[PDB]
Design a binder for these strands. Structure first.
Ligand SMILES: [Mg+2]
Ligand SMILES: [Mg+2]
Ligand SMILES: [Mg+2]
Ligand SMILES: [Mg+2]
Ligand SMILES: [Mg+2]
Ligand SMILES: [Mg+2]
Ligand SMILES: [Mg+2]
Ligand SMILES: [Mg+2]
Ligand SMILES: [Mg+2]
Ligand SMILES: [Mg+2]
Ligand SMILES: [Mg+2]
Ligand SMILES: [Mg+2]
Ligand SMILES: [Mg+2]
Ligand SMILES: [Mg+2]
Ligand SMILES: [Mg+2]
Ligand SMILES: [Mg+2]
Ligand SMILES: [Mg+2]
Ligand SMILES: [Mg+2]
Ligand SMILES: [Mg+2]
Ligand SMILES: [Mg+2]
Ligand SMILES: [Mg+2]
Ligand SMILES: [Mg+2]
Ligand SMILES: [Mg+2]
Ligand SMILES: [Mg+2]
Ligand SMILES: [Mg+2]
Ligand SMILES: [Mg+2]
Ligand SMILES: [Mg+2]
Ligand SMILES: [Mg+2]
Ligand SMILES: [Mg+2]
Ligand SMILES: [Mg+2]
Ligand SMILES: [Mg+2]
Ligand SMILES: [Mg+2]
Ligand SMILES: [Mg+2]
Ligand SMILES: [Mg+2]
Ligand SMILES: [Mg+2]
Ligand SMILES: [Mg+2]
Ligand SMILES: [Mg+2]
Ligand SMILES: [Mg+2]
Ligand SMILES: [Mg+2]
Ligand SMILES: [Mg+2]
Ligand SMILES: [Mg+2]
Ligand SMILES: [Mg+2]
Ligand SMILES: [Mg+2]
Ligand SMILES: [Mg+2]
Ligand SMILES: [Mg+2]
Ligand SMILES: [Mg+2]
Ligand SMILES: [Mg+2]
Ligand SMILES: [Mg+2]
Ligand SMILES: [Mg+2]
Ligand SMILES: [Mg+2]
Ligand SMILES: [Mg+2]
Ligand SMILES: [Mg+2]
Ligand SMILES: [Mg+2]
Ligand SMILES: [Mg+2]
Ligand SMILES: [Mg+2]
Ligand SMILES: [Mg+2]
Ligand SMILES: [Mg+2]
Ligand SMILES: [Mg+2]
Ligand SMILES: [Mg+2]
Ligand SMILES: [Mg+2]
Ligand SMILES: [Mg+2]
Ligand SMILES: [Mg+2]
Ligand SMILES: [Mg+2]
Ligand SMILES: [Mg+2]
Ligand SMILES: [Mg+2]
Ligand SMILES: [Mg+2]
Ligand SMILES: [Mg+2]
Ligand SMILES: [Mg+2]
Ligand SMILES: [Mg+2]
Ligand SMILES: [Mg+2]
Ligand SMILES: [Mg+2]
Ligand SMILES: [Mg+2]
Ligand SMILES: [Mg+2]
Ligand SMILES: [Mg+2]
Ligand SMILES: [Mg+2]
Ligand SMILES: [Mg+2]
Ligand SMILES: [Mg+2]
Ligand SMILES: [Mg+2]
Ligand SMILES: [Mg+2]
Ligand SMILES: [Mg+2]
Ligand SMILES: [Mg+2]
Ligand SMILES: [Mg+2]
Ligand SMILES: [Mg+2]
Ligand SMILES: [Mg+2]
Ligand SMILES: [Mg+2]
Ligand SMILES: [Mg+2]
Ligand SMILES: [Mg+2]
Ligand SMILES: [Mg+2]
Ligand SMILES: [Mg+2]
Ligand SMILES: [Mg+2]
Ligand SMILES: [Mg+2]
Ligand SMILES: [Mg+2]
Ligand SMILES: [Mg+2]
Ligand SMILES: [Mg+2]
Ligand SMILES: [Mg+2]
Ligand SMILES: [Mg+2]
Ligand SMILES: [Mg+2]
Ligand SMILES: [Mg+2]
Ligand SMILES: [Mg+2]
Ligand SMILES: [Mg+2]
Ligand SMILES: [Mg+2]
Ligand SMILES: [Mg+2]
Ligand SMILES: [Mg+2]
Ligand SMILES: [Mg+2]
Ligand SMILES: [Mg+2]
Ligand SMILES: [Mg+2]
Ligand SMILES: [Mg+2]
Ligand SMILES: [Mg+2]
Ligand SMILES: [Mg+2]
Ligand SMILES: [Mg+2]
Ligand SMILES: [Mg+2]
Ligand SMILES: [Mg+2]
Ligand SMILES: [Mg+2]
Ligand SMILES: [Mg+2]
Ligand SMILES: [Mg+2]
Ligand SMILES: [Mg+2]
Ligand SMILES: [Mg+2]
Ligand SMILES: [Mg+2]
Ligand SMILES: [Mg+2]
Ligand SMILES: [Mg+2]
Ligand SMILES: [Mg+2]
Ligand SMILES: [Mg+2]
Ligand SMILES: [Mg+2]
Ligand SMILES: [Mg+2]
Ligand SMILES: [Mg+2]
Ligand SMILES: [Mg+2]
Ligand SMILES: [Mg+2]
Ligand SMILES: [Mg+2]
Ligand SMILES: [Mg+2]
Ligand SMILES: [Mg+2]
Ligand SMILES: [Zn+2]
Lengths: 362, 206, 60
RNA sequence: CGCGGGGUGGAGCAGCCUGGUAGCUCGUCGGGCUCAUAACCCGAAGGUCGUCGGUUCAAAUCCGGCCCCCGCAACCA
RNA sequence: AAUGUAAAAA
RNA sequence: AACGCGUUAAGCGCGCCGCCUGGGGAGUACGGCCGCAAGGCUGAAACUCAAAGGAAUUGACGGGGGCCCGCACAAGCGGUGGAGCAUGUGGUUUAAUUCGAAGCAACGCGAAGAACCUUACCAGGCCUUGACAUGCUAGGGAACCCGGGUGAAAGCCUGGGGUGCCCCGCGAGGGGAGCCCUAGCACAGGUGCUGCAUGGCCGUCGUCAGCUCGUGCCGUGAGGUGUUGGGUUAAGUCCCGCAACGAGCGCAACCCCCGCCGUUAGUUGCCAGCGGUUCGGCCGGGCACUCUAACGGGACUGCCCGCGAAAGCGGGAGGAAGGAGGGGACGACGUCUGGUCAGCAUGGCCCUUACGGCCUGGGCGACACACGUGCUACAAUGCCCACUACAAAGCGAUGCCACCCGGCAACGGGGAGCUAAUCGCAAAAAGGUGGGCCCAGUUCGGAUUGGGGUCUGCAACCCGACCCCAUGAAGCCGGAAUCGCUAGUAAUCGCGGAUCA
């Protein structure tokens, strides 16, 4: 297990010098009496002190399992050297906590997730590749300990999928499948091509947890104003002296509506409200779109080069264009070996591009 | 696409068994294993002079290895120093009677197993493989012969895609038995991979 | 698992049945004749070289 | 709210009036012909009969309330 | 008695 | 430009008008003029492409044509698809179910021997120039043999025995070769990737008759001619003709088995021939015959007839065998970016207390399914039991085992013959004769399973095979569909060998 040591060790090492200088500018700010006088402004101050716990603990735990472990173990069959191995069996136990406490910090990492696959540039082979990816994440779920349900799926003309969607249950379902965003790339001699030469094919992937609803709470009586007024058109003296028309404007949203199709004020006041309900439902569905579709991807051309990870079956090599990381087993990776990818490199760069954005300028 | 080994095609005519003797339901396996590793040492520390064929004759502890170098000069040395030290190593790894004879070569340009090693030599030397084959054929045909043929297949000139280069002249009916055709294969270790060579010299008839 | 494996078939430092056939030239395990102690492949090469006395391309 | 109709395999429709066994087309699934897909051939699976009650030996079927969809009507001053 | 996309000639 | 034109110029000249100036946009838009209208005349650009085109050449292709071929179709027999089982694969499952093969040309294929071995996978215990090579430095120990502690084995830890061969010597001792061990360096090792880097070998259309070169002639040129054409054959086989003539790789032929026969050969064989006989070719005896494995002979459209220019074809006689007598070996220039880097070799790439090495146990034998290849049957042209006759080719001395004894039996014991035309595996089965069953899920059918038992091998839970008793399943001829075979063939019956305890 000496191949993942320096990876996890140095992983908690780059936070040492940076947080060292910042916590110093804060800890000395917590001294002067004039600081705490600020109401909630001072909470943001003592808050950063609540981080000197989830940083100094590694300065002690990770540093001790590096100074003591690396010593007595350089050479010996099983005497005092192999006996020092179980001494750090908890070093892999504690490795779990440092890894976890940097993934759940995502928006909704803890809850489940939905993953929709859809073919793209690459002809009918691309339509066939999508089913491969489906069968990849599917096995990756069971083997991760997750449950799976195909929420929807549609076979292609000759391939096997023009579209597919799969809800993965279990904790951190959105966390692990997060870096699976974007279009992947496939390279291999096309099984559908007569000359069988090497063709490229693409396919997009998306991930997102889940939400709820709120239909009636909107039509709170406190919000909208209701008006009464005589009706336009026929009626006799009854129409002139009896106001039955109604105008139910929604004050906040400003959207108004008027009705007077029936001789009655209540049945108009009633209808005019069922009408406002429909429009206010269609106004909540429009705003319900940006906050449930912008999370998918701010782009995703699915074209060429829009990919973030290529899988070449000719020369046998996958490659994450994000971490620059490489590999030599596309045949197994497209079966469940996503852990090696998501764990070390994927979640890293994923949180890195946002973790370097906040701790600098954003 | 087929083309069987003309040598094996004539183990009942033309070419006679390279190793020739007799064994039983218990000696054949051994008398072959050792017999083989014999030529193993000779293929190496003897080709340095153009070793073509190598016979074997036995019956009981007797062994008559008849080398056919193009130049016996290197196999003997100048009197008996070299040729003797061979029987040395031989009897060394084999507690049996040696008998290293040394037949000759009336003309190396007519031993296919030689011409093969010939062109194959020029290959590793890094020279043309179209011009080369042409010489080795025009030489074999000019140096008296009924027919001849040479072939090299693989990365001709270290090129990306493989290939196969053809060159031949005169009659060479591999389907006729009353033909006789010296055959000889040869490799060519290079910085870009192996590379097979073949020689088809048409000799006798009837 | 090719060289230390042909070596395994040689030492016979253990039980009877555990020893098994093996080719002399290559190291094959299946299709290895006892008569020559060779795999079907090389046997065909050698038999075309005449390096197997008495043997000849049969036909009837 | 009033009067009329409807809700049955995944889609669209029979069956109810005259209670006893739920049928048709499509799709789905297995197997064929084709280099392969479709077409075509051979098999197979699939229905709480909206829901809650009532009558009956027995309810898709008859009786009643409810939810849902459809159409009509909502006129005189 | 229809169809078969998109990376190969020193 | 070629196709073609050619006193009906697309020739050679003069006069005049009309018209073209890359494709798409586009005969569109705008404007103008005409029209009842539909629409016509005139007639752009932005933008965009690196081509759009003409004629001709080779080839591929056609629900184009002519000629011709192959169990390709038809005529005919027997099959799979159905059932149970074996096996190969898909898939699913698993700690792993190691890898490859993918229409024909992957699917009883690599595997001509997965219980550990094999074995490349998994779990676990372990070793770190290492199981194997070449070479440098070093201490110690000869080589080599032997046991105890430890354990699942591997490995680890440890004791006794031992004192050979060379240099200085009476000895002591010390220096050297070889081998093993520790330490260290160079290096090993990899069934780890890439058959879209390769050799080699192989499948493939296809045993199809075809594919080319030299010189010559035609064309500006790709290229054509030859190889086309009339006749024929299994064939680019031959015949004739031909602006071509000639040659090469392919079909043939030269090799093998099987048919008839002769010579060489007499431990195979035969009272065929006489004698003897424990009447078994056992003895005397002979090479006839059979057989045995060596060399030859014979068949070539040679002979008669009809047609024909010839080649050749049709019929007949003789012949064991007539136009290739039957079967095999042999498969062109090439095509499939075919197959295999896992048989081996190999360029590049990757790992190196490890992607290498050792063992014990597991898996490759997993099962809700699907396909391929196959075995056994549904029965009376049959099943069972007893008796009786006829093969070929093969294999066997730590191997095949006659013969007698025990046992229901597989097997166990005693024990003869045999480096084998001399002895054994060895009843060949179907068939012949006899006898019973009498149309029944049955004496058909033996899947399944309970119990008992034999053999191999350290070891049969996972996971072998065989024997005996008992239990006897699906299956009454198989949906759509699909396979093989033209003669000693299909069908059917049994025997052998490789692989290997
Ligand atoms: Mg309020
Ligand atoms: Mg108004
Ligand atoms: Mg009115
Ligand atoms: Mg009024
Ligand atoms: Mg009023
Ligand atoms: Mg009022
Ligand atoms: Mg070759
Ligand atoms: Mg060429
Ligand atoms: Mg010539
Ligand atoms: Mg090389
Ligand atoms: Mg090895
Ligand atoms: Mg074995
Ligand atoms: Mg419905
Ligand atoms: Mg009725
Ligand atoms: Mg009725
Ligand atoms: Mg249907
Ligand atoms: Mg179907
Ligand atoms: Mg079917
Ligand atoms: Mg059916
Ligand atoms: Mg079904
Ligand atoms: Mg009801
Ligand atoms: Mg509705
Ligand atoms: Mg509605
Ligand atoms: Mg109305
Ligand atoms: Mg009214
Ligand atoms: Mg009114
Ligand atoms: Mg009125
Ligand atoms: Mg009125
Ligand atoms: Mg009135
Ligand atoms: Mg070039
Ligand atoms: Mg003319
Ligand atoms: Mg004229
Ligand atoms: Mg005139
Ligand atoms: Mg004229
Ligand atoms: Mg212009
Ligand atoms: Mg233009
Ligand atoms: Mg115009
Ligand atoms: Mg127009
Ligand atoms: Mg206009
Ligand atoms: Mg005008
Ligand atoms: Mg006008
Ligand atoms: Mg006018
Ligand atoms: Mg008009
Ligand atoms: Mg009109
Ligand atoms: Mg118009
Ligand atoms: Mg107009
Ligand atoms: Mg007009
Ligand atoms: Mg104008
Ligand atoms: Mg103009
Ligand atoms: Mg204009
Ligand atoms: Mg044209
Ligand atoms: Mg044609
Ligand atoms: Mg037609
Ligand atoms: Mg015609
Ligand atoms: Mg015609
Ligand atoms: Mg016609
Ligand atoms: Mg057929
Ligand atoms: Mg038929
Ligand atoms: Mg017929
Ligand atoms: Mg059947
Ligand atoms: Mg079946
Ligand atoms: Mg079946
Ligand atoms: Mg397999
Ligand atoms: Mg499955
Ligand atoms: Mg496992
Ligand atoms: Mg499997
Ligand atoms: Mg496989
Ligand atoms: Mg085995
Ligand atoms: Mg060593
Ligand atoms: Mg040395
Ligand atoms: Mg040194
Ligand atoms: Mg010593
Ligand atoms: Mg010692
Ligand atoms: Mg000593
Ligand atoms: Mg003990
Ligand atoms: Mg011990
Ligand atoms: Mg000595
Ligand atoms: Mg001395
Ligand atoms: Mg002394
Ligand atoms: Mg001493
Ligand atoms: Mg020494
Ligand atoms: Mg030494
Ligand atoms: Mg290797
Ligand atoms: Mg290939
Ligand atoms: Mg190759
Ligand atoms: Mg032919
Ligand atoms: Mg010319
Ligand atoms: Mg031709
Ligand atoms: Mg003809
Ligand atoms: Mg002529
Ligand atoms: Mg002529
Ligand atoms: Mg002969
Ligand atoms: Mg005579
Ligand atoms: Mg007599
Ligand atoms: Mg007589
Ligand atoms: Mg008598
Ligand atoms: Mg006698
Ligand atoms: Mg006598
Ligand atoms: Mg003779
Ligand atoms: Mg003849
Ligand atoms: Mg004649
Ligand atoms: Mg004649
Ligand atoms: Mg006459
Ligand atoms: Mg003539
Ligand atoms: Mg004549
Ligand atoms: Mg004549
Ligand atoms: Mg005739
Ligand atoms: Mg034949
Ligand atoms: Mg031939
Ligand atoms: Mg299952
Ligand atoms: Mg299938
Ligand atoms: Mg009997
Ligand atoms: Mg008997
Ligand atoms: Mg007999
Ligand atoms: Mg034998
Ligand atoms: Mg033996
Ligand atoms: Mg006895
Ligand atoms: Mg017994
Ligand atoms: Mg016994
Ligand atoms: Mg006895
Ligand atoms: Mg004896
Ligand atoms: Mg004998
Ligand atoms: Mg004998
Ligand atoms: Mg016998
Ligand atoms: Mg019955
Ligand atoms: Mg009966
Ligand atoms: Mg045991
Ligand atoms: Mg049945
Ligand atoms: Mg079929
Ligand atoms: Mg036939
Ligand atoms: Zn081999």
């Amino acid at each position: 297990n000496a191949s993942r040591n320096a990876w996890k060790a140095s992983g908690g090492i780059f936070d040492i010098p940076q947080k060292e200088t910042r916590l110093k500018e804060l800890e000395r700010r917590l001294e002067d009496p004039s600081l705490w006088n600020d109401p909630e402004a001072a909470r943001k101050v003592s808050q950063e002190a609540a981080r000197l716990r989830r940083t100094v603990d590694t300065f002690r735990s990770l540093e001790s399992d590096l100074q003591g472990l690396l010593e007595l173990m350089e050479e010996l069959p099983a005497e005092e050297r192999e006996a020092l191995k179980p001494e750090l069996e908890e070093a892999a136990k504690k490795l779990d906590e440092l890894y976890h406490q940097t993934l759940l910090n995502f928006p909704h990492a803890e809850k489940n997730a939905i993953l929709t696959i859809q073919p793209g540039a690459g002809g009918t082979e691309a339509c066939d590749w999508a089913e491969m990816l489906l069968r990849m994440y599917t096995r990756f779920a069971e083997r991760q300990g997750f449950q799976v349900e195909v929420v929807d799926l549609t076979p292609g003309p000759e391939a096997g999928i023009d579209y597919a969607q799969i809800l993965v249950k279990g904790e951190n379902a959105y966390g692990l499948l997060s870096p699976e965003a974007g279009v992947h790339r496939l390279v291999r001699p096309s099984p559908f091509d007569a000359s069988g030469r090497r063709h490229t094919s693409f396919a997009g992937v998306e991930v997102i947890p889940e939400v709820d609803e709120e239909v009636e709470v909107v039509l709170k009586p406190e919000e909208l104003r209701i008006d009464v007024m005589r009706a336009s058109g026929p009626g006799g003296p009854g129409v002139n002296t009896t106001d039955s028309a109604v105008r139910v404007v929604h004050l906040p949203t400003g959207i108004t509506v008027t009705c007077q199709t029936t001789r009655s004020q209540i049945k108009n006041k009633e209808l005019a409200l069922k009408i406002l309900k429909a429009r206010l439902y269609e106004l909540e569905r429009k705003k319900r779109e940006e906050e449930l579709k912008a999370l998918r991807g701010e782009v995703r051309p699915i074209e060429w080069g829009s990919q973030i990870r290529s899988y070449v079956l000719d020369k046998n090599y996958v490659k994450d264009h994000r971490t620059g990381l490489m590999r030599h087993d596309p045949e197994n990776v497209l079966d469940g070996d996503l852990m090696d990818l998501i764990w070390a490199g994927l979640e890293w760069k994923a949180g890195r591009r946002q973790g370097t954005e906040e701790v600098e300028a954003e | 696409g087929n083309k069987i080994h003309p040598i094996g095609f004539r183990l009942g005519i033309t070419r006679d068994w390279e190793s020739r003797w007799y064994a039983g339901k218990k000696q054949y396996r051994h008398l072959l294993l050792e017999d083989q590793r014999i030529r193993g040492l000779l293929e190496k520390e003897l080709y340095s002079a153009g070793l073509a064929r190598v016979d074997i004759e036995r019956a009981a502890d007797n062994v008559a290895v008849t080398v056919h170098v193009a130049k016996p000069g290197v196999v003997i040395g100048r009197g008996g120093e070299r040729i003797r030290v061979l029987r040395e190593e031989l009897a060394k790894l084999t507690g049996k009677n040696v008998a290293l004879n040394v037949q000759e070569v009336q003309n190396p340009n007519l031993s296919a197993p030689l011409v093969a090693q010939r062109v194959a030599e020029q290959i590793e030397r890094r020279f043309a493989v179209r011009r080369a084959i042409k010489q080795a054929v025009q030489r074999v045909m000019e140096s008296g012969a009924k027919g001849a043929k040479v072939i090299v297949s693989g990365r001709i000139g270290g090129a990306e895609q493989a290939r196969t280069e053809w060159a031949a002249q005169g009659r060479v009916p591999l389907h006729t038995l009353r033909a006789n055709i010296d055959y000889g294969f040869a490799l060519a270790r290079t910085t870009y991979g192996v590379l097979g060579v073949k020689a088809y010299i048409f000799l006798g008839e009837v | 698992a090719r060289k230390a494996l042909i070596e395994k078939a040689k030492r016979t430092p253990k039980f009877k049945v555990r020893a098994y056939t093996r080719c002399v030239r290559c190291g094959r395990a299946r299709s290895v004749y006892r008569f020559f102690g060779l795999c079907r492949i090389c046997l065909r090469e050698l038999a075309h070289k005449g390096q197997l006395p008495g043997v000849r391309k049969a036909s009837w």
